[PDB]
Symmetry: C2
Subunit: 274 residues, 2 copies
């Protein structure tokens, strides 16, 4: 394990950390986007009152790596969750999340009958190309099991026709959840081989999606509030910034508090990772 620290706080005033002052928080440089804050308020000496320690994360959006709004590739939602990146499976709800497997703009060729492994048990197969070489029949699988299939027409006027979005139901009680996007550039119909050329892939590990429950507790951050696109997690009871010590906030986040006299206070937050 290793440690990533934030800016140092001094004195007994209110304090605030975000991505710019705490390198542990998630941050996307291309879109210049982050989601997390940690605040300390209303200290009495070194004791934070109930509700004075607040971790907040609010959904934000970033450009697909394969950026092409006209073909249906504009932005997707992102959310920091205890210093890790997650994808909200419904872009308006902060409490249902999954890990991103792929966000890619690399070119791949799939030959009919062959599988492109996407990672974590997910794959796409070109099952067939049509005689005229303008349509490809794709199939999406998880651990060898059928999930979905679609016929994609690759040389129409409409650039969105090249994109396949897999929408699944009953994922953490959400329906119409986009779990995979695949953009097919073209099809190549050779003498012996036909191949599909892919460029643009986005996949979340929907099979491992989770829900943050109102009853969940994260160490001393044990008052979870879910308000649409924002999680706000707060302390139910007093929290002491014990001098000359480390104190868990929760779920891998900590404060380091300096060895000073009780007339002073100096501390910074940090995150522990592996």
């Amino acid at each position: 394990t290793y440690e990533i620290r934030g800016q140092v706080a001094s004195g007994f005033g209110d304090q605030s950390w975000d991505a710019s002052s705490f390198a542990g928080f998630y941050y996307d440089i291309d879109d210049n986007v982050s989601t997390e804050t940690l605040t300390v308020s209303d200290l009495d000496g070194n004791v934070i009152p109930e509700g004075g320690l607040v971790y907040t994360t609010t959904i934000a959006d970033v450009d697909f790596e394969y950026y092409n709004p006209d073909a249906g590739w504009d932005q997707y939602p992102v959310m920091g969750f205890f210093a890790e990146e997650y994808i909200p499976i419904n872009p308006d709800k902060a409490d249902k999340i999954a890990k991103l497997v792929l966000d890619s703009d690399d070119k791949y060729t799939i030959r009919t009958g062959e599988m492109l492994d996407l990672g974590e048990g997910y794959a796409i197969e070109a099952k067939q190309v049509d005689v005229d070489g303008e349509k490809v029949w794709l199939e999406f699988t998880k651990d060898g099991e059928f999930v979905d299939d679609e016929i994609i027409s690759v040389s129409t006027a409409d650039d969105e026709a090249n994109t396949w979005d897999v929408e699944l139901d009953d994922i953490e009680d959400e329906d119409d959840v986009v779990v995979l996007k695949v953009h097919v550039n073209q099809v190549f119909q050779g003498a012996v081989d036909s191949i599909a050329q892919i460029e643009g892939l986005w996949l979340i590990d929907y099979a491992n999606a989770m829900t943050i429950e109102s009853d969940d507790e994260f160490g001393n951050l044990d008052d979870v509030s879910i308000d649409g696109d924002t999680l706000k997690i707060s302390n139910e009871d007093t929290f002491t910034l014990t001098r000359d010590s480390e104190e868990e906030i929760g779920e891998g986040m900590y404060f380091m508090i300096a060895d000073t006299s009780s007339s002073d206070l100096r501390y910074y937050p940090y995150v522990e990772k592996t």
Copy 2:
């Protein structure tokens, strides 16, 4: 390996990072001390001119963990060097450094004839206690070899009499180098056993001490300047903040530069560790 990022820089103006804005730099919370800065100056578009990229580290001082100025335990020198802590072996010179092995205020008892292993091949032995139980004969060793010895009187008026400082010569061309401090609280003369009680230990790995040479080069930071207590390391040639990329500065430090149009510039430094 893992990554620790600093604050984001935007635009074509001059920029500066220190410990408060770059969590990769060394920082001591108890003494509130750091030593490192990284600056970017005089950009022409995304090209830093010769001398425009400067890494500086200046020796600072911290309290011994066993803090007791009267017994000779006040402060020792520290220096960040490419995000790692080093001890300058001469507190006025930034170019001769060693790693800290121990900075301790824990109590230990050593029985006569027994060895306290200090780490990294170093040990101290209580060889004998005197009949009156007011003096202990200590010996310092490295990989079993004799380095130094001293008779310490533990119940005099002078509190500095309890401290043994080992001073060695010919370490990276420095003489009178304090490599070990040992503070003996007291001696206990039992019926069968006599033991020495230690509290206060400080050790640097002097055997692996190194010198930063004027001719040394650290990737693209290849102009080393040594000025007493300060190392200033600079770029001899142009350095491009290539957009949508990572670029090595040197010795584990990098810039991450955002994918933007050439009308903009956004980047942050980071350090790679293992």
